[PDB]
Amino acid sequence: ASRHGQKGILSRLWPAEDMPFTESGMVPDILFNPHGFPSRMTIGMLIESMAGKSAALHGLCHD
Amino acid sequence: GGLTCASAPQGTLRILEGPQQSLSGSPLQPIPASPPPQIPPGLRPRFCAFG
């Protein structure tokens, strides 16, 4: 689960070489279907993703 | 030589002790409002591409 009520079982363990790699070499470790947003309207997860990426990038800690 | 009923009182006084109101200043908060989260100055990119 996330901190926004978005629960979900673990359905697969996707091999690390079959994951979509980014142009920076990275590779996600969680894949989250984008269809839980439209009906549940948890816009706080889409802001937490950006806040946490900015934190990990700048060494900061946002509130 | 006994006690008899006398004339009815003509008025009543009720005493109470009361202090007064000061000016309205309405000093809501030490550091007031919800101060906004904001940009650290300069920051700089902490990541580069390969090549």
Swiss-Prot record, chain A:
Residues noted as binding RNA in the record, renumbered to the chain: 7
Entry's transmembrane regions: none
Subcellular location: Nucleus, Nucleolus; Chromosome
Disease: Treacher Collins syndrome 4: A form of Treacher Collins syndrome, a disorder of craniofacial development. Treacher Collins syndrome is characterized by a combination of bilateral downward slanting of the palpebral fissures, colobomas of the lower eyelids with a paucity of eyelashes medial to the defect, hypoplasia of the facial bones, cleft palate, malformation of the external ears, atresia of the external auditory canals, and bilateral conductive hearing loss. TCS4 inheritance pattern is autosomal dominant.
Domain statement: The active site comprises the fork loops, the loops and the rudder that stabilize the transcription bubble and assist polymerase translocation.
Family: Belongs to the RNA polymerase beta chain family.
Function: Catalytic core component of RNA polymerase I (Pol I), a DNA-dependent RNA polymerase which synthesizes ribosomal RNA precursors using the four ribonucleoside triphosphates as substrates. Transcribes 47S pre-rRNAs from multicopy rRNA gene clusters, giving rise to 5.8S, 18S and 28S ribosomal RNAs. Pol I-mediated transcription cycle proceeds through transcription initiation, transcription elongation and transcription termination stages.
Quaternary data: Component of the RNA polymerase I (Pol I) complex consisting of 13 subunits: a ten-subunit catalytic core composed of POLR1A/RPA1, POLR1B/RPA2, POLR1C/RPAC1, POLR1D/RPAC2, POLR1H/RPA12, POLR2E/RPABC1, POLR2F/RPABC2, POLR2H/RPABC3, POLR2K/RPABC4 and POLR2L/RPABC5; a mobile stalk subunit POLR1F/RPA43 protruding from the core and additional subunits homologous to general transcription factors POLR1E/RPA49 and POLR1G/RPA34. Part of Pol I pre-initiation complex (PIC), in which Pol I core assembles with RRN3 and promoter-bound UTBF and SL1/TIF-IB complex.
Protein name: DNA-directed RNA polymerase I subunit RPA2
Organism field: Homo sapiens
UniProtKB/Swiss-Prot annotation, chain B:
Localization, UniProt: Nucleus, Nucleolus; Chromosome
In-chain residues carrying the UniProt-annotated modification Phosphoserine: 26, 34
Location of region: Disordered: 18-41
Top-level taxon: Eukaryota
Ranges of biased composition (kind: Pro residues): 29-41
Remaining remarks: It is in an antisense orientation to and overlaps the gene of the DNA repair enzyme ERCC1. This gene overlap is conserved in mouse, suggesting an important biological function.
Subunit structure of this chain's protein: Component of the RNA polymerase I (Pol I) complex consisting of 13 subunits: a ten-subunit catalytic core composed of POLR1A/RPA1, POLR1B/RPA2, POLR1C/RPAC1, POLR1D/RPAC2, POLR1H/RPA12, POLR2E/RPABC1, POLR2F/RPABC2, POLR2H/RPABC3, POLR2K/RPABC4 and POLR2L/RPABC5; a mobile stalk subunit POLR1F/RPA43 protruding from the core and additional subunits homologous to general transcription factors POLR1E/RPA49 and POLR1G/RPA34. Forms a heterodimer with POLR1E/RPA49. Part of Pol I pre-initiation complex (PIC), in which Pol I core assembles with RRN3 and promoter-bound UTBF and SL1/TIF-IB complex.
Family according to the record: Belongs to the eukaryotic RPA34 RNA polymerase subunit family.
Functional description taken from the UniProt entry: Component of RNA polymerase I (Pol I), a DNA-dependent RNA polymerase which synthesizes ribosomal RNA precursors using the four ribonucleoside triphosphates as substrates. Involved in UBTF-activated transcription, presumably at a step following PIC formation.
Protein name (database record): DNA-directed RNA polymerase I subunit RPA34
Complete-protein stretch covered: 103 to 153 of 510
